[PDB]
Structure formats: C-alpha cells, structure tokens
Nucleic acid binder design. Structure first.
Length: 90
DNA sequence: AACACCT
C-alpha cells in the first residue's frame, strides 16, 4: 500500500558521495530534497561497477512517501538514459 | 533512509 507521491519527475543531484553510501537529489519541480540510495537506482552507468549518481546531473525518478520523508526510487537518466554516476564510483 | 566528502 506504498503511496507514490510523484512519478517520472526530473530533478538535479545536489551531491552524492560514493563512500558514504547515501545522497540527496534536489527536485527542480518542488525544490525539495529527497532521500536516495544506490539500491534505489534502476539504471546506472554500465562502466561503473558500483551504482552511483553523478552530482549536478539531471535525473529522473519516482517520488514515494517515506516515514522520514520523500523517498526516491527507480532513478534513471532522462529518456531512459543510464545514470552517469560519480567519479568516485567503483 | 533524516545530510557532504571519498579516488
């Protein structure tokens, strides 16, 4: 019964640290930060062994209401393009 | 899952 706050929504990655294992994405439609995790990334750069999201890179994802706040899921690049990811990515 | 720093 998980509620989906939003669907395919374009946003911008404020910053994502590979070492930390977590990061935040700033939605350009709501200007509100959302929780994001590597396991929440459906598609990513194939050249990267570890899933990651590039900083300053526009991303597309669905917003799902979370207990701690909005949660991002199925994060992919625009037009189905794979996420570039971060350089720190393995 | 509740906040930035790493090769």
């Amino acid at each position: 019964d998980k509620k989906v706050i939003a669907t395919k929504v374009l946003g911008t990655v404020k910053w994502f640290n590979v070492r930390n294992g977590y990061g935040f994405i700033n939605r350009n439609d709501t200007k509100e930060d959302v929780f994001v995790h590597q396991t929440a990334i459906k598609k990513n750069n194939p050249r990267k062994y570890l899933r990651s999201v590039g900083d300053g890179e526009t991303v597309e994802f669905d917003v799902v209401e979370g207990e701690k706040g909005a949660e991002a899921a199925n994060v992919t690049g625009p037009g189905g393009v794979p996420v570039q990811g971060s350089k720190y990515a393995a």
